[PDB]
Amino acid sequence: MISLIAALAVDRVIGMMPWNLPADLAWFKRNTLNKPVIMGRHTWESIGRPLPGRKNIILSSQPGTDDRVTWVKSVDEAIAACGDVPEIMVIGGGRVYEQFLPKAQKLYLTHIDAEVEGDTHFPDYEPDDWESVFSEFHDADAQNSHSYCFEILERRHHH
Ligand SMILES: Nc1nc2c(c(=O)[nH]1)N[C@@H](CNc1ccc(C(=O)N[C@@H](CCC(=O)O)C(=O)O)cc1)CN2
Ligand SMILES: [Cl-]
Ligand SMILES: [Cl-]
Ligand SMILES: [Cl-]
Ligand SMILES: [Mg+2]
Ligand SMILES: [Mg+2]
Ligand SMILES: [Mg+2]
Ligand SMILES: [Mg+2]
Numbered sequence: 001m002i003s004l005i006a007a008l009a010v011d012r013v014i015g016m017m018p019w020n021l022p023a024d025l026a027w028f029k030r031n032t033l034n035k036p037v038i039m040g041r042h043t044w045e046s047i048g049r050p051l052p053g054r055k056n057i058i059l060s061s062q063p064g065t066d067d068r069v070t071w072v073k074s075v076d077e078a079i080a081a082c083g084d085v086p087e088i089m090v091i092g093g094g095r096v097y098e099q100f101l102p103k104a105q106k107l108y109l110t111h112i113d114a115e116v117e118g119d120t121h122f123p124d125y126e127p128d129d130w131e132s133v134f135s136e137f138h139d140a141d142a143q144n145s146h147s148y149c150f151e152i153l154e155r156r157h158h159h
Contacts, residue, residue, distance in 0.1 A: 002079070003106040004090045004097055005031060007148075009116045014092060016046035018116040020145040023138060027150055031108050032089045036082040040096040044069065054089075057081050059096055075099050094120040101125060107153040114146045129157040 006014055007024055033053050041060035049068075050056045056069040059078050063071035072078045082088045090100045101123045107130065109122075130153040137149045 001086065001106065002088045002090060002100060002104045003108060004100060004104050005108040006092060006097065006122050007110040007112060008122050009112050009114045009118070011115075012122045013116050013118040014094060014097075014120055014122050015116070015118050016043060016093065018118070019112055019114050020143075021110075021112070021148060023144050024110045024112075024148060024150075027108075027110065028091075032091070035087050035089050036085060038078050038082075038088060038090045038096065038100070040093050043091065043093045043096070055082070075103070079103075094122070098123045102158075105155045107151075109151045109153070111149040111151060112146055113148065126157075126159065129155060129159065131156050 005028060007021070008014060009018065032051070036055040036057055037051055038057045038059055039047075041058055041062070041064065044058045057078050058064070058069050058071050059075070060071065061073055063073070070081055072081050079088065090096060090104065107125070132151060133154050134152040135149060138144070138147060140147050
């Protein structure tokens with residue numbers, strides 16, 4: 001099964017960080033550890049080093065040479081490279097989320113209370129097609145710059 005995981009500012013702006021949220025990074029790690037992660041080449045270059053404890057699959061029509069990750073050229077190849085696993089995590093960026101959304105059955109979202117200047121957005125999804133099965137709000141604190149709300153949604157309908 002395919003899931004997307006993303007952190008969204010107001011207006012669904014995503015980035016590679018205008019905010020400083022170690023709690024969100026802990027949420028990201030907890031929910032991706034021991035699962036393959038699929039990302040586009042822009043996201044890969046922004047991370048710079050393979051995420052530990054996860055198979056790192058990079059979707060790009062023009063692969064790099066880095067032997068530390070697995071390079072694939074299509075959504076279908078990305079999925080095949082993951083093989084028989086319970087859950088595949090798609091970690092962005094904008095275009096990769098857009099291509100994978102139709103195949104996804106679960107969303108892990110962090111809704112951040114920040115207005116920011118970026119131009120890359122998380123895909124449009126029809127809220128009526130999803131059910132909110134978890135939500136938790138957290139205030140900002142000495143370690144986290146903004147307030148945020150974790151949410152998990154499960155797909156109920158497809159169009
Ligand atoms: N919800 C959430 N989802 C996301 C991101 C986020 O920002 N938060 N960011 C996007 C991908 N970018 C990164 C950049 C850095 C890291 C990263 O470095 N993670 C460490 C944890 C951080 C650390 O302890 O050093 C890890 O092992 O997972 C993860 C995703 C995609 N999805
Ligand atoms: Cl957590
Ligand atoms: Cl990308
Ligand atoms: Cl505090
Ligand atoms: Mg090689
Ligand atoms: Mg889009
Ligand atoms: Mg769309
Ligand atoms: Mg319904």
